[PDB]
């Protein structure tokens, strides 16, 4: 079934494209004189392709071979039990990421209402699916039929300015991949106008996606050399406390620095001198004494 | 007592601004600022010379073209007949559309049926034939529910094409 | 001096310190200046164009506007299907003139070679010919499950 209805791309067939349908799109989106398309019609042929796979998935129901039931729950889970145990460790990465790309944001938003509805997926009647739906009939008459679905609960998020759907491909990757030292983060920090500790957060994922896109092994110690200042503190913050873990706001000190306390730190910076640029952006500028060097490098035993 | 013992409590942040002093935890947010001053040496701190950065209006400019030239204006660069039905880009919306699309507009606008005169419109005629609206294809009428001479239907829509 | 007043004492001290050059600024009585000086070689840089350094990756234009791309081929085939559909609606009798009022069967009729047959006859078949030779315990079993 999977090969017949999911991988057989030729077996997929899109709604017929008439001349009026064609000219519409070529004057609609390739030439989008009328810019936007925000509606629900049989057009754009791309959501439908993923939809056709999706709708084929929804129609699927685990059952006998005596009837039009395509596959048996035993045979189904057998296929997974067969293929899961055939998964390459890298395939686990794609799976583990898939479990979190889709399922985890669903199972987080779940209540008692959805319990009956979850079983309809695996077509696996467990305790009671007839009497319980009337309990859901109670909440659903007092609940919008659109929101109570599981598919729609995540339709909105924050910060549509930088989206994950576009930032997969690392920007400027052709340049900073050639000689990574030539590109300290302060060069690409401006490329992301988000909060700083956030911009240096996403910059890690940019490096890790960049490497995998080129199959090379990713620099596992970039974040530590990236969040150097962050790292050197906690290593100390750990070696003062009796707790093991990261530093939350609570255990941070309660000092009240004056309004002008870093002035000497400023006229230092506002009057710094650097012979070659790399000196200015060196990754070990943070490291002044041995007490620093011992901690920063205390990670890599090597 | 205890609830009052909590209502009395003032936060660390509340204490901080009160004493006019940045708290210790909230000073990492200044670190990126200090980074630019540190990395501003040389080129980055030298503005464009002679260039203000603010430019005033120096002409009264407008390229608003007539409608006729606007029709086939972009013949070569793009897909023929640019301003198909764009009310916002064209002054005349219905200009240039093909026979069905203009019909589609009045078919989606679609002022519902009412009692008619004995000069019953093609809408009455096309229904008694099962050819409701798209099926007068070669025919020049664009609004099927109108009682006028066929030239009057065509003469009104000769500009639109 | 409003800025570099202080650090200069330290700046010299670490940059290499005072190296003493005997007769550095001395002018010879004939007119020569002994100890030909260090010379300023700094020149306006000529090979720096970050725009040509990072281009629109496939169509290399030194730009910065992020405009998405339609994959080559899937744009051309897309266009080639439009003209073939364009050729149907607006110029039906081959007269070439734009017929603004098209025929119904011309409005809704599909493109001539829209439904790819070559891909069937030139590729799908050539696969099926080799498929005819697969083992008998397989060809049925293939047909069976599919």
């Amino acid at each position: 079934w999977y090969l017949q209805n999911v991988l057989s791309v030729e077996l997929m067939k899109l709604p017929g494209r008439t001349n009026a349908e064609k000219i519409a799109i070529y004057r609609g989106r390739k030439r989008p004189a009328t810019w936007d398309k925000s509606k629900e019609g049989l057009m754009d042929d791309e959501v439908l392709l993923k939809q056709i796979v999706k709708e084929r998935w929804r129609t699927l129901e685990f059952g006998d071979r005596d009837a039009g039931y395509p596959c048996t729950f035993s045979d189904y889970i057998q296929f997974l039990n067969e293929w899961f145990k055939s998964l390459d460790e890298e395939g686990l990465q794609r799976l583990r990421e898939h479990f979190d790309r889709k399922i985890r944001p669903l199972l987080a938003v779940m209540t008692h209402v959805d319990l009956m509805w979850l079983e309809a997926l695996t077509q696996n009647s467990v305790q009671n699916k007839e009497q319980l739906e009337r309990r859901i009939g109670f909440q659903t008459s007092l609940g919008t039929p659109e929101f109570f679905d599981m598919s729609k609960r995540l339709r909105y998020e924050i910060n549509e300015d930088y989206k994950v759907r576009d930032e997969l491909g690392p920007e400027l990757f052709a340049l900073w991949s050639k000689a990574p030292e030539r590109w300290p983060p302060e060069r690409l920090a401006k490329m992301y106008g988000l909060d700083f500790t956030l911009v240096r957060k996403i910059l890690v994922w940019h490096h890790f996606k960049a490497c995998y896109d080129a199959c090379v092994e990713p620099d596992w110690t970039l974040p530590k050399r990236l969040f150097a200042l962050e790292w050197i503190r906690d290593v100390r913050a750990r070696k003062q406390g009796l707790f093991y873990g990261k530093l939350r706001f609570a255990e941070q000190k309660i000092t009240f620095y004056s309004d002008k306390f870093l002035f000497r730190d400023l006229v230092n910076r506002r009057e710094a001198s650097y012979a070659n640029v790399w000196e200015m952006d060196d990754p070990y500028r943070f490291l002044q004494t041995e007490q620093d060097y011992e901690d920063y490098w205390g990670d890599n035993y090597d | 007592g205890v609830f009052e013992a909590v209502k009395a409590l003032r936060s660390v942040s509340e204490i901080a601004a009160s004493r006019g002093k940045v708290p210790h935890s909230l000073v990492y947010n200044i670190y990126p600022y200090l980074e630019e001053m540190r990395r501003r040496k040389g080129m980055m701190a030298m503005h464009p010379p002679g260039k203000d950065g603010i430019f005033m209006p120096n002409r009264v400019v407008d390229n608003r073209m007539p409608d006729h030239l606007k029709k086939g204006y972009y013949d070569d660069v793009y897909w023929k007949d640019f301003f198909a039905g764009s009310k916002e880009q064209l002054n005349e919306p219905k200009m240039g559309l093909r026979g069905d699309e203009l019909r589609a507009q009045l078919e989606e606008s679609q002022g519902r049926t009412a009692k008619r005169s004995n000069r019953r419109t093609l809408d009455d005629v096309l229904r008694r034939l099962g050819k409701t609206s798209r099926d007068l294809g070669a025919l020049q009428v664009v609004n099927p529910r109108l009682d006028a001479k066929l030239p009057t239907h065509m003469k009104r829509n000769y500009l639109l094409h | 001096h409003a800025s570099k007043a202080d650090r200069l004492a330290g700046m010299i001290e670490d940059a290499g310190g005072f190296e003493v050059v005997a007769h550095l600024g001395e002018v010879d009585k004939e007119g020569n200046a002994k100890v030909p000086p260090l010379h300023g070689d700094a020149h306006v840089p000529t090979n720096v164009n970050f725009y040509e350094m990072a281009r629109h990756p496939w169509e290399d234009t030194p730009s910065s506007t992020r405009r998405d791309g339609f994959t080559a081929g899937s744009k051309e085939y897309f266009e080639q299907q439009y003209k073939k559909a364009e050729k149907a609606v607006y110029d039906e009798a081959g007269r070439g003139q734009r017929n603004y009022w098209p025929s119904k069967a011309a409005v809704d009729g599909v493109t001539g070679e829209e439904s790819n047959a070559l891909l069937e006859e030139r590729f799908f078949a050539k696969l099926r010919d080799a498929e005819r030779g697969v083992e008998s315990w397989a060809r049925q079993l293939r047909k069976k499950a599919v």
Binding site: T197, L229, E230, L247, R264, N268 | H24, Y28 | -
Partner: peptide, 21 residues
Amino acid sequence: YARGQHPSYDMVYAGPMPEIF
């Protein structure tokens, strides 16, 4: 750094150690 003219980087300029992985 020995003369105090060098721009410092204390632990005090540390933000949160973010969960990347």
